[PDB]
Write a protein that binds this DNA or RNA. Structure first.
Lengths: 77, 94, 58, 137
RNA sequence: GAUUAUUGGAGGUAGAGCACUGUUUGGACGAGGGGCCGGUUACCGAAUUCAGACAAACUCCGAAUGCCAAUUAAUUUAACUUGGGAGUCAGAACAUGGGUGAUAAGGUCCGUGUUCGAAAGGGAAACAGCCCAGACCACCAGCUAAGGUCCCAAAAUAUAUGUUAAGUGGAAAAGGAUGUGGCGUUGCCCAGACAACUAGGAUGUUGGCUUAGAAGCAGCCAUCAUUUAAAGAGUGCGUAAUAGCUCACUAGUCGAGUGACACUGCGCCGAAAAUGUACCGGGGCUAAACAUAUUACCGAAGCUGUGGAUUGUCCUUUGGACA
RNA sequence: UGGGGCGGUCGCCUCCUAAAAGGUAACGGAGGCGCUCAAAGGUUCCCUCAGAAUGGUUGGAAAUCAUUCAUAGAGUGUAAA
RNA sequence: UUUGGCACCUCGAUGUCGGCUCAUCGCAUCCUGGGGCUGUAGUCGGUCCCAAGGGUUGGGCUGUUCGCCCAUUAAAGCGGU
RNA sequence: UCUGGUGACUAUAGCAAGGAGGUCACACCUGUUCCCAUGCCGAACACAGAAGUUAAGCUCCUUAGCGUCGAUGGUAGUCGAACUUACGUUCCGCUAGAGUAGAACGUUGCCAGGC
């Protein structure tokens, strides 16, 4: 026999919107554990570390320091 | 101390690089002060003869086009499985 | 500035991206042709499927 | 009898054997070495055989380096049994050699003695080979 | 709805390769248990300075994929939405792409393909598992797609040019020899290349431990002036020891070739097993094997000749005009 | 369920296989959960790394003490990421 | 020429081990060796060619393919069939 | 228009070494009465000062010394195609990591004094 047939149901992490696309005012931008991406302008951070938009506009992924990333959402329409 | 070189023109593809290595040529670069970067080709047996008489760390007066450059071997890529030199770098020392 | 494209190899056995590119160029059955004006877009499509088509100036 | 002291994982995937060798393509320790020209797994009883054959011809003369180490375990099922009730127990340890790679090096001995030692070693190994010297030029 | 270019991101993608690390290895260095008198050392352990392995259970990058935007171009009049009617869930099987696991599996995932089943077929011996097809549909159109071209049996006897030689064709393999040559070689000689010819074979010198003496040979050399155009405290064949001729040397004869590469494509044992040969199906053949072409055209649900279908778009003539 | 039996299994979480996203099988490779916490919650704030040597009553040589380099190598209630 | 896989027909049936009878496709060979070469004195050993050209036994002992003794003989394979 | 407050840029901006400096600044400095404060301690925090001081911090100038950045060229790898499924080969796109040459002892916004 063996003792190895367990796994977990995969959570569908990763990016949910793209850079450059228009989102509405409350939509989920990124699902992750921890902060792989930090929140920037108009982007809030959920309690499960979900990154969500706080207004409607265009999503921009940019860099943060030497080595970090952030998402901002700009209001331009 | 008198190698001859021929300037490679633009965009050698992968086919003619190995076609050129099928002859006795080896691709080479020349860079350093005094010049820009020049992509040249060099005959292999002549380069081995120059190296055998001038030492691994030597000075070579090699001709590019019109002019001659005093130059030393910076590095070289070698294919150990069939023992041929496959690329050579030339550093202009002046 | 004009190109004539003729589909010369078949489309059976080829992958589905290539069938979709052959369809967007306007080709239907084998040895059918089309005349189109020259772009870099059209040439990208020819470059994607150039083992199936034949192209000349005209 | 070469084997690691501990591993993190006793059952590993089996190595890929295509390509040319990543590193260790030069004699750096002795005067001469033995280079591989094809690809195999080398199983550390082959290493022990080829080292013993090479040593006693040199009559405790020069020195010999082994540039190959078996890190990877390999399993097998002991008796021929039904397919698949989990992986089998670990059987031996392999290194993977690809063309280009030096297997052994020697120094402190004449050239023809080294050629004879490395030829005797190469008849134990499952791979084709070539006697080489230090590169220069 | 879509489908196919440039510009932007996401993954930190993997393949590769090592950005601290974590682990695993063969480097080389002084101090601590210690060897000893609390140290002197060895070996160890740990620490600082070469080269490797995983990075399936890793860090620095990034082919192709995917998400998207264009006040941006060729394609499909289809889209997505609601509703009616289903079949299918051995759904597989040969195909990788990559991979797991026994690398058979004519077993497990996955990314495209081919059939598909109803798409049958037609040139992959014949095979819903290469070239080709989706279908108006037939039909003595005759001319194309290729996978093609003695006899079969569409279709180059099919030649021309310069290199091949296993029935390879139409069966791979570890070592061993001499293979077509071949250039990239590299380095060897009219004082005559490898010549072979045969004419010199020694010596105080086994000098030494002299080992069953051994004076080429229990195995350690102590490995010194030679005779001669030339020869070894004898290349060596040997040898219980000698018998030692030359392969250590050159004037007699004397001409055109030599040693290592790399191999590079293609030769030489396997191919020892049994109702039935043998893989173009295959008999028969060297073309009916490498490199180049080269016009020939064959060739089929490809064009152009005929035809009783229908759909779509147009006018609106509802014609079948085009599709 | 690589016949069936015997053995081993029903759920959830985390890695790996898993091949730029996401998804992805096996009786494939490794581990956890079936709670805990009156502060280990909130909050203004405030205040803010070990180890390594170094050399010292202690000295396990290091417990506490002191100087300087030390990456979150420390630490994070709980497995891994 | 014992295991793996199946499942690639046969749950609308492909009769299972020894033995007898009869072979033979038909092959790395026990005998003759017919020949021959050697770390072959005849006698051996070992190898090569050849051979399935031709030959290749009667009994005691079992549950069966396995064996084991007696007495001979120039001598007592290979199994897909 | 020098500093100094305060923002923006991936360390090209950092560490190290060497040399200079001072009331419009800036720190060390002096103390605990008071606000306040140390799981002890005016060390720190806080407050009151201004005798001393350029030593250290800080500023400015030299170094490529360690880090950081880093081409060109040439290779691994790989999409597509063609041979063939050879531990492959060939053609065509994309071109790495490493390493070489070389960069770099920071640019720039706003403000107020000094000017």
């Amino acid at each position: 026999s063996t003792k190895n047939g367990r796994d977990s149901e995969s959570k569908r992490l990763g990016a949910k919107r793209a850079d450059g696309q228009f989102v509405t005012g409350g939509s989920i931008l990124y699902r992750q554990r921890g902060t792989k991406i930090y929140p920037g302008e108009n982007v809030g951070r959920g309690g499960d570390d979900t990154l969500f938009a706080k207004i409607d506009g265009v999503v921009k992924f940019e860099r943060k320091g030497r080595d970090k990333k952030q998402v901002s959402v700009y209001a331009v329409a | 101390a008198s190698l001859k070189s021929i300037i490679r023109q633009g965009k050698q593809t992968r086919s003619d690089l190995k076609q050129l290595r099928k002859s006795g040529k080896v691709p080479a670069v020349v860079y350093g002060y005094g010049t820009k970067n020049v992509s040249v080709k060099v005959d292999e047996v002549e380069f081995i003869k120059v190296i055998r008489e001038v030492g691994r760390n030597g000075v070579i007066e090699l001709g590019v086009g019109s002019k001659t450059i005093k130059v030393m071997v910076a590095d070289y890529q070698f294919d150990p499985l069939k023992n041929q030199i496959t690329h050579i770098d030339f550093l202009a020392i002046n | 500035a004009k190109l004539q494209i003729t589909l010369t190899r078949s489309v059976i056995g080829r992958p589905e991206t290539q069938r979709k590119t052959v369809e967007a160029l306007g080709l239907k059955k084998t040895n059918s042709s089309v005349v189109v004006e020259d772009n870099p877009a059209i040439r990208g499509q020819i470059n994607k499927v150039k083992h199936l088509v034949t192209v000349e100036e005209k | 009898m070469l084997l690691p002291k501990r591993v993190k994982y006793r059952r590993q995937h089996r190595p890929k054997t295509t390509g040319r060798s990543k590193g260790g393509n030069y004699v750096t320790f002795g005067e001469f070495g033995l280079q591989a020209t094809t690809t195999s797994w080398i199983t550390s009883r082959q290493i022990e055989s080829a080292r013993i054959a090479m040593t006693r011809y040199m009559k405790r003369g020069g020195k010999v380096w082994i540039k190959i180490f078996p890190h990877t375990p390999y399993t097998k099922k002991p008796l021929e049994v039904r397919m698949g009730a989990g992986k089998g127990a670990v059987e031996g340890w392999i290194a993977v050699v690809k063309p280009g790679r030096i297997l052994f090096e020697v120094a402190g001995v004449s050239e023809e003695v080294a050629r004879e030692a490395l030829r005797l070693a190469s008849h134990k190994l499952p791979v084709k080979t070539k006697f080489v010297k230090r590169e220069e030029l």
